[PDB]
Each structure stands twice: as structure tokens, then as C-alpha cells.
A paper describes a structure:
NRTIs mimic natural deoxynucleosides or deoxynucleotides and target the reverse transcriptase (RT) enzyme. RT incorporates active metabolites of NRTIs into the growing DNA chain which act as chain terminators due to their lack of 3ʹ-OH. M184 is part of the conserved active site YMDD motif found in several viral polymerases, including [name]-1 RT and HBV polymerase.
Overall, the positions of the cytidine and oxathiolane are similar as in the RT–DNA•(−)-[name]-TP structure. Examining the van der Waals radius of V184, it is clear that there is a direct interaction with the branched side chain and the sulfur in the oxathiolane ring of (−)-[name]-TP. Structure alignment through residues 107–112 and 151–215 in the p66 subunit between the WT and [name] structures with (−)-[name]-TP shows that the oxathiolane sulfur is shifted away from residue V184 by 0.3 Å compared to M184. Although the calculated maximum likelihood coordinate error reported in Phenix refinement is 0.33 Å for the WT and [name] (−)-[name]-TP structures, this shift is propagated to cause other atoms of (−)-[name]-TP to move more than 0.33 Å from the WT structure. The combination of a steric shift and altered triphosphate orientation likely results in reduced binding affinity of (−)-[name]-TP (280-fold higher Kd in Table 1) with [name] than with WT RT.
Author numbering:
A (entry chain B): 5 to 86, 97 to 213, 233 to 356, 360 to 428
B (entry chain A): 1 to 65, 70 to 133, 142 to 556
The structure:
DNA sequence: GTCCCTGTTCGGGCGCCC
DNA sequence: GGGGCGCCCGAACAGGGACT
């Protein structure tokens, strides 16, 4: 085999991202995996004269005593030059075809940008640095360069099983069928066998979370005040929402716990608004040259709400994620893995997340709960407590 | 002597060229030491005499340790390529395990034993007032540390492979070597390590070969069952300057790793207005008092222990007021592995539950660096205070495994906003407006019982008037109050339950909230003619 | 757009190690 | 003169809300 040249986008350096502290577990696993990869020629030791760096860690998959190395290539990916039926299937299995990539060499003059560093416990030693000689798992370029080789492999299986949808996303193969679960699994095993000789999701059970208005036999000034603020916000998403009649009940300067009987108008306006919320959002077109943005709100009691959009108030999807000794960060981490999965399946792209958590909290613990082979972009926000009421 | 290791290839930054800089005048005490050093180096191949075919030059000088030769490559360092530093942190004694046998070796003339890339030697040209260049790593170049540290690691890698159960802590040219052998057999391994280094050109002078406890290492003294910091001494000036307090801040911080209780808030608050290092500063009573407290805890004798991987790590946190926190980490009670402080103020407004959650995060990260695992925590906060906070709070927040410790001052939430509006509590509709032009404002309220107040403010901001109005409603209400606001800004601050703030005004608001039996704060959208948010809007906007 | 207020980064100084 | 980590501080952004 001979390599494919690869460039960065013009006016861009390679990544220079500092390695973060790893646990003893993860370091032991990384050192194991790396020495073997260095035997098999997939990575080489390098020096400090290579100025590039990219974080590494490792995840303990399932219960299995098998670790998976995971390189955070988000930066490098940002800097690397540049299947509708799948969401319908009864079952989707996700396969990890990452190691296939190690069979293709990698443009020599590019290898230096794939540098990473293994830390030691208590800084017994300086870091050990490696760079890749082959297509690295997690890199944007790896499925690209390997596509033609991936197609050649799959093409016969696709022929023999035309009802089956196979989608690839970096290290991942999504395999969808309408088979009952036993024959599905048997087919997956069949596709695995086919893959060997070269070298559980349920999409149409994905519900959306509608905005919904409370029902009450008596309304206080407070109740109505909450209602009108909520409607007034929602009207930014559903311009047919109307608040005029209801608001007119709050003329005067009244006690919060004073009871207000609703007029005929106000009941009608409330009835309309109830219906308008049913009617699906209009005029939202997925734009693949724009970021997918995800917001998550903590609702409490293991309840999480999310929306995916690209323009403010123009939601592509809105959802809920539900689950004593609950672990918020775990839950959040699991929520963003779930949302990312949906987002890949529906649009083949990974959303930028707005996380309702302090940076240090998140960065302290999220690798403890991560099970995906990809990592989405994210940023940290201070949720104005208004919006957590809006998706109540 | 000179390592036969491969040189590390190194470049200038694109489109740049070597330094051309005049050697500044130098005392003869130094010139004598220079040529003494240079005649030997030149004899040994480490520096070569150059001619006039070398355009470049860089100033050199010396300081006493014997003498250390230095080169002010600040200009070369600017033109050189970037390096990824391989030194990720500083080994700490509390992460060492008990070893049967221990050695500490220093490597002799370390840098000068590692060859410098040939194609790069020319740029290192320097002139004694005689012209030379470097054939080995120079002290002052920014590439020398990483190239040394990396070369050292290549050199130790075979020995480490062959001897996986000998532990070598490698800090620049410093080696701590620990084994579970008897001293006889340990010493045989040491010798094997020294001949290994000598094969690669690195000598280990017996002069710096420590064979008996207490070992001197990284600023500590290592005894077989305990460790201590090397003596710390604080200045005793009467007049203090910026640069003096910094020396005191820094030294206290360093002490805080093993001396429990250290605090540096007030001392630090001093260094705020300053624009230059020379300024002297009045040691405020708050600060002068702190000094003595610290100064007192230093007099007592103190030591950490080593790490037993087969027991648990325990971190125990204590609160010290003014956003100051101290901790101790141990496996067995009153036998500290180490200690620390946390004192960072994050946010304009915060409470003690957040700060405690930040101390936990810090300690967790630090523990992962040193021991590679998370400790179990012991915290001055009720399991039920925590759950209240975790419930109501809108952010994901979490604390790893922990038990309560009733060692006051206990961490507590100082007030709680009601979830439902209060019956028999007067309803205040507050609001503020400000003029961006004149900076003039108004804050006021209107209440369901007919009360109405408007206060005019000067030199204010919109957000401020909005907080002023809330404060005003708190001031003129009974022990139970409903307040309706249209400010996300104000609602956002108060709903997160701060007990401390950078803002005097928010502090005053906080004090009111604690006085009250019941507060219910509610939000409405502005300019939507909600009554009587609508009625108080007219009032505070008039003339504004 | 502008001001305001809040957050983050990143470069000062000092400590400590080599 | 160099590299590392730590601590504190203030400068320069980057956001989102409220306003003419
Ligand atoms: N202030 C320092 N600047 C440095 O560049 N170094 C570097 C990093 S470690 C290396 C030590 O060099 P040397 O071995 O000649 O130092 P040394 O005289 O302390 O040790 P030795 O007497 O040669 O065994 O110098 C050390 C310093 F303390
Ligand atoms: Mg030495």
C-alpha cells in the first residue's frame, strides 16, 4: 500500500493541547496498548522537537476487562482539510470497526500532527510521546481515506441483504434492520464474520418532548403569571401563541395567591394555545454547513430535557432523557452520549453541546462515564433558570 | 564526557536567523571562572573555537552555585522552533511507596554530556572577553531542558525494561532509586544503573551519591517512615513591599503542603491596586494578624508519611472563613500524607456549598496526579444540606463518596427561596430603570396593599436599579414577602443563594434574605402590561 | 449596534525543583 | 539565562440581556 497526501486548512497549525491527568488504571491500560502498538509498527516514539500534542485516555468498555484507547482528536479534526432510512429501522446495532484503520499507512509529513503523550503517576518520569504511522482511530481523515476500501468490503453484504442499512461514522458502523431481534442479531453476527475474513438501538421508538400547559380548576394570579411568561417565551417558537386575553386578567396590583376566575375569552385563548403546541414546528431545514447545537436543561429527579437547533428557536428536535444515589455528572455524560448518537443517526453529524455544569466539575469526571469512540465539541453555560421552567 | 546518543534535530522558526548581540562588560571574578570553565570544555570537545566565518554571537555570564556558566539566549530562544515540554509536573514525596532500599544519585555536568545538533551549533556562538560555539546543550537555551529530559528517558528506557520493579524517579538530572531488595543486592543494582549511565556518557559522582537516610530530594528530607520539608524561613521586615509579600505568599503556599491551617487571603488582597513591584504597603490588621497565625503554626514540627496502595485515601476538609479552605489527606488518622489549602474566589457571587464543591474538585485532580486515584472525602456538611442543594440547583453538580464530619464551622445554606407564593405575605412588584446618557436612575415598588415607593439613584446602571428595587422591597416588608421582578439578571443571582459577593449591594440584599422568614421571588416578562409590573414600570421610568 | 456584567484565558510577578 | 508545577492578580477577549 502507498499513502494519500493530507493537508491542514490554510493558515492553521497542528494541535497543541495539554495532556490531562489520568488514573492509574487508565495509564496502565494505555501503556499496555501502546507498547503493543509500537511492536506492530502502528506508532513510533518521538521527541520534544515535535511541537504538537493531543490528549489521550482510555475507556473500560461494557464490563469486559478490555480497555479501548481513545484519542481526543477534536482539535486536529477541526483543522483537517475537508441515509435517511436508518432512523426508521426497528433495531440498530453499533459496531466498532476502528482497528481496520491501522492497516493503512499515513502520509509521513502528516504523522507529526498526531502526536500524543502518556503521563506517569506522580510524575515519576517525563511524558512518553508517540506519533501515528497508520490511520488513527477518531481522526476525521481516517474514514475518508478508507472509504473506497470500506465500500469494497461491504458491497457484497449489502447485495445479499438489501433491506439492511449500513452507515459508517468514523470508528462506527451503524447497522439497521426491521428483523425481529433474534434474526437481527444473527445477521449482525453474519456481518461480523464477513468483516473478519478481510482483517442495541431502536430509532423508531424515539419520542419528542412537546411544550405543555398545566390544567387547573382554579387559577391564582401567580399561576397565570407563570403561564403568561411561559407562553410569551414559547411564542418565539410558535408565533401563533397569544397572551393578550390572559394577560388582561392581571390588571391591577394583586396578591400572588388571589384566585382569578378565567373569562370566556381567556379560556378560548388558552384552548387555542393548547392546540397550537400540538401543530409541529414549521420551517426548519437542516443545514450541513452549520453547527448542530444542543442545549440540555437539568429538570431534577433524573429528568433531563434537550433541544437540537442551528438557529435560535428553530428546533430540529426536542427531547427528554429520564433515569437516591444518583450521579448528576454521570447522568449528564450519558445524556450527551445519547443525544450525540441520535444526532449522528438522524444527520450524520455531531452537535456542539451547551453543558449546564461548571467546566472543572465536568472535566474532573466525564472520562469516568464515557463509552463512545467519538467526542463532541462542547462549551459550558450558566442556564438562566427561566428556560428550565419552559420545558417543564 | 559526551553521550553517544543521537542528537535531536532542531530548527529556527521559518524566515529567521541567529542572534547577533554584543557581549556586555563583565567583572573579572567572572572572566577568570569563564576561561577556567571554557578551557576545560574546549579541551573536552564540548565547545569549539570558531573564526570570523561565524556572524552570530550571544552574551554570556556566570553566577555562583562552584560556578555556573550561563548564556542569555533570550534572543535565540525567540527565533528557535517550539518544543512540546515533556515535564508534566513535580513528583511529590507523599506519592512515594515504602521501599526496602533507597538511593539518590545526581548526574554530573548533565547538559554538557548531551550533544547538540550539528546544524544548529553555529547559532550558539559566544565570545569570552576568545570566540566559541557549543557542541553540547547550553544553560540558557529554551530547548535544553526538554532535550535533556527526553534524552534521559531514552537512556533509562532499556534499564527500566530489564528492571521493571526498580522504581526510578527521574527529575532532570536527579535520580531517586527505590527497590524491594536487601541493601547488598540493591547496591549491586545501583552499580548496574551507574555503568548503564556511564555507557551513555552520564557520570554519577560519588560526591552526590546518597546512600543513607535522611535522603535530600526535591526540597525534602526522606526518612524511612516519614518525610519532612526542608526548613522554611519567613522575612521579618517591618516595612513590606509588593515583592516582599509575594515572597511571603509564595513561601506560605509552599509550606501549606504539609503545615495544616495556613491562610493567605488578607496578605493576597494587599496586592491589588499595585502597578509595579517596588510599592510598599500597609499591613492591614486583618493581614498582620494572619501573618502571626501562620508564623505560629510553622514553629511546630511536622511530617508526612508515604503511600500504602493497599489502604484508602482520605481527604478531610475544614472551613476557615472568607472563602478559605484547608485539607488533609491520609490513610490512617493523624498520619497525614499531605495537606493543602483552597482559596480561589470564582464568581462575582457564590455560597459555601459551591466553594466546597470546588475544593473537592481541586483535591480530586491533585490526588489523581499524585496517587492515580480519587480519595474518599470527610466534609463539614450535612448529607441533607447537600441533597437540598443538589435538588434545587439547576446545574449538574456532584461530590464523590463522602461522609459528614461535625467539625465546625459546618457548611450551610443561609436562606431558602419558597417554591410557592406566600399566603398572607404582601406582594411587591419591583422595577428599576436607568439612563445610559446621564447615569441617573430610579428603583421602586408598588404593593397589593397600596404601598408605593420610588427612590432616585445617581451614577447607576440598569442592572443596579433592578437590584436596588429588590433590596428596597426587602427593606420595607415584614418577615414574609412576595416579590415579583422582571429581571433575569437579579433573579439569576438570588436564586443561586449566594452568601457572599463582590457587590456591596448584593451583600446588603443577602443580609436581608437571611433576616426573613419567607421570601418568594417570581419572574414576569417586562413591557407586556402585566399588572402591576406595568404600574411600577411607569413610576420608575418617569423622568428616565 | 451600545453599555453592562459575567465568565475565561493568558501573561505578569513571586514560591519551589533541577 | 532555561524548563516544569503551584499561587495570586489584572488585561484582553467572549458571551447574553436590556436598551434607542
Ligand atoms: N538554575 C538552573 N538552571 C539550569 O539550567 N539548570 C540545569 C538543569 S539541571 C542541569 C545541571 O547541570 P550541572 O550538572 O553542571 O549542574 P550541577 O553543577 O548542579 O551538578 P553537578 O555538580 O554537575 O553534578 O542544569 C539547573 C539549574 F539549577
Ligand atoms: Mg548534576
Amino acid at each position: 500500500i502507498e499513502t494519500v497526501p493530507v493537508k491542514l486548512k490554510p493558515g492553521m497549525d497542528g494541535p497543541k493541547v495539554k495532556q490531562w491527568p489520568l488514573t492509574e488504571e487508565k495509564i496502565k491500560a494505555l501503556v499496555e496498548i501502546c507498547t503493543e502498538m509500537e511492536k506492530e509498527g502502528k506508532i513510533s516514539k518521538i521527541g520534544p522537537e515535535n511541537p504538537y500534542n493531543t490528549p489521550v485516555f482510555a475507556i473500560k468498555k461494557k464490563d469486559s476487562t478490555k480497555w479501548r484507547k481513545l484519542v481526543d482528536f477534536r482539535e486536529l479534526n477541526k483543522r483537517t482539510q475537508d441515509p435517511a432510512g436508518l432512523k426508521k429501522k426497528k433495531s440498530v446495532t453499533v459496531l466498532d470497526v476502528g482497528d481496520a484503520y491501522f492497516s493503512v499507512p499515513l502520509d509521513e509529513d502528516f504523522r507529526k500532527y498526531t502526536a500524543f503523550t502518556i503521563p506517569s503517576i506522580n510524575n515519576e518520569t517525563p511524558g512518553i510521546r508517540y506519533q501515528y504511522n497508520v490511520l488513527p482511530q477518531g481522526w476525521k481523515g481516517s474514514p475518508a481515506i478508507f472509504q473506497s476500501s470500506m465500500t469494497k468490503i461491504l458491497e457484497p453484504f449489502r447485495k445479499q441483504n438489501p433491506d439492511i442499512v449500513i452507515y459508517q461514522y468514523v470508528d462506527d458502523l451503524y447497522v439497521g434492520s426491521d428483523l425481529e431481534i433474534g434474526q437481527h442479531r444473527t445477521k449482525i453476527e453474519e456481518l461480523r464474520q464477513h468483516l473478519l475474513r478481510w482483517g442495541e438501538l431502536h430509532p423508531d421508538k424515539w419520542t419528542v418532548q412537546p411544550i405543555v400547559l398545566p390544567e387547573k380548576d382554579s387559577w391564582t394570579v401567580n399561576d397565570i403569571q407563570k403561564l403568561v411568561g411561559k407562553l410569551n417565551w414559547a411564542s418565539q417558537i410558535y408565533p401563533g401563541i397569544k397572551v393578550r386575553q390572559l394577560s388582561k386578567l392581571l390588571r391591577g396590583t394583586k396578591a400572588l395567591t388571589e384566585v382569578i376566575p378565567l373569562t370566556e375569552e381567556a379560556e378560548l385563548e388558552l384552548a387555542e394555545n393548547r392546540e397550537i403546541l400540538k401543530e409541529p414546528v414549521h420551517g426548519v431545514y437542516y443545514d450541513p454547513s452549520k453547527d448542530l447545537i444542543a442545549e440540555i436543561q437539568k429538570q431534577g429527579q433524573g429528568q433531563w430535557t434537550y433541544q437540537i437547533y442551528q438557529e435560535p428557536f428553530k428546533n430540529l428536535k426536542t427531547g427528554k432523557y429520564a433515569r437516591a444515589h444518583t450521579n448528576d455528572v454521570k447522568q449528564l455524560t450519558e445524556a450527551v452520549q445519547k443525544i450525540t448518537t441520535e444526532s449522528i443517526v438522524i444527520w450524520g453529524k455531531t452537535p456542539k453541546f451547551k453543558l449546564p455544569i461548571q467546566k472543572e466539575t465536568w472535566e474532573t469526571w466525564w472520562t469516568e462515564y464515557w463509552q463512545a469512540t467519538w467526542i463532541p465539541e462542547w462549551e459550558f453555560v450558566n442556564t438562566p433558570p427561566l428556560v428550565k421552567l419552559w420545558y417543564q | 564526557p559526551i553521550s553517544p546518543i543521537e542528537t535531536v534535530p532542531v530548527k529556527l522558526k521559518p524566515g529567521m536567523d541567529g542572534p547577533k548581540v554584543k557581549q556586555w562588560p563583565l567583572t573579572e571574578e567572572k572572566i577568570k571562572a569563564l576561561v577556567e570553565i571554557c578551557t576545560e570544555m574546549e579541551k573536552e570537545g564540548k565547545i569549539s573555537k570558531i573564526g570570523p566565518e561565524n556572524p552570530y554571537n550571544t552574551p554570556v555570564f556566570a553566577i555562583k552555585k562552584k560556578w555556573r556558566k550561563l548564556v542569555d539566549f533570550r534572543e535565540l530562544n525567540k527565533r528557535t522552533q517550539d518544543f512540546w515540554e515533556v515535564q508534566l509536573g513535580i513528583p511529590h514525596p507523599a506519592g512515594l511507596k515504602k521501599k526496602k532500599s533507597v538511593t539518590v544519585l545526581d548526574v554530573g555536568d548533565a547538559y554538557f554530556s548531551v550533544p547538540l545538533d550539528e546544524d544548529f551549533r553555529k547559532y550558539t556562538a559566544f565570545t569570552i572577553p576568545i570566540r566559541y560555539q557549543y557542541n553540547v546543550l547550553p544553560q540558557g537555551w529554551k530547548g535544553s531542558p526538554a532535550i535533556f529530559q527526553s534524552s534521559m528517558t531514552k537512556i533509562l528506557e532499556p534499564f527500566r525494561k530489564q528492571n521493571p520493579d526498580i522504581v526510578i524517579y527521574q527529575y532532570v538530572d536527579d535520580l531517586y532509586v527505590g527497590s524491594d531488595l536487601e541493601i547488598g543486592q540493591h547496591r549491586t543494582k545501583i552499580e548496574e544503573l551507574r555503568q548503564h549511565l556511564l555507557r551513555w556518557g552520564l557520570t554519577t559522582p560519588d560526591k552526590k551519591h546518597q546512600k543513607e537516610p535522611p535522603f535530600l530530594w526535591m526540597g525534602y528530607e526522606l526518612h524511612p517512615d516519614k518525610w519532612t520539608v526542608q526548613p522554611i524561613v519567613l522575612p521579618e521586615k517591618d516595612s513590606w513591599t509588593v515583592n516582599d509579600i509575594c515572597k511571603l505568599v509564595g513561601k506560605l503556599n509552599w509550606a501549606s503542603q504539609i503545615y495544616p491551617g495556613i491562610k493567605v487571603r488578607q496578605l493576597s488582597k494587599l496586592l491589588r491596586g499595585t502597578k509595579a513591584l517596588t510599592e510598599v504597603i500597609p499591613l492591614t490588621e486583618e493581614a498582620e494578624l494572619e501573618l502571626a497565625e501562620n508564623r505560629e503554626i510553622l514553629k511546630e514540627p511536622v511530617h508526612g508519611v508515604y503511600y500504602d496502595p493497599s489502604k484508602d485515601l482520605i481527604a478531610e476538609i475544614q472551613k476557615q472563613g472568607q472563602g478559605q479552605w484547608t485539607y488533609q489527606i491520609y490513610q490512617e488518622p493523624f498520619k497525614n500524607l499531605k495537606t493543602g489549602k483552597y482559596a480561589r474566589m470564582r464568581g462575582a457571587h457564590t455560597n459555601d456549598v459551591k466553594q466546597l464543591t470546588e475544593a473537592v474538585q481541586k483535591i480530586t485532580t491533585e490526588s489523581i496526579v499524585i496517587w492515580g486515584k480519587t480519595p474518599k472525602f470527610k466534609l463539614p456538611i450535612q448529607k441533607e444540606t447537600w441533597e437540598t442543594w443538589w435538588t434545587e440547583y439547576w446545574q449538574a453538580t456532584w461530590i464523590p463518596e463522602w461522609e459528614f464530619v461535625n467539625t465546625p464551622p459546618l457548611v450551610k445554606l443561609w436562606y431558602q427561596l419558597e417554591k410557592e407564593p406566600i399566603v398572607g405575605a404582601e406582594t411587591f412588584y419591583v422595577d428599576g430603570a436607568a439612563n445610559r446618557e446621564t447615569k441617573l436612575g430610579k428603583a421602586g415598588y408598588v404593593t397589593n396593599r397600596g404601598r408605593q415607593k420610588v427612590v432616585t439613584l445617581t451614577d447607576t446602571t440598569n442592572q443596579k436599579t433592578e437590584l436596588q428595587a429588590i433590596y428596597l422591597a426587602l427593606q420595607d416588608s415584614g418577615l414574609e414577602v412576595n416579590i415579583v421582578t422582571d429581571s433575569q439578571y437579579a433573579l439569576g443571582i438570588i436564586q443561586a443563594q449566594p452568601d457572599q459577593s463582590e457587590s456591596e449591594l448584593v451583600n446588603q440584599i443577602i443580609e436581608q434574605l437571611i433576616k426573613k422568614e419567607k421570601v418568594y421571588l417570581a419572574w414576569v416578562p417586562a413591557h407586556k402590561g402585566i399588572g402591576g409590573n406595568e404600574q411600577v414600570d411607569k413610576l420608575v421610568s418617569a423622568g428616565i
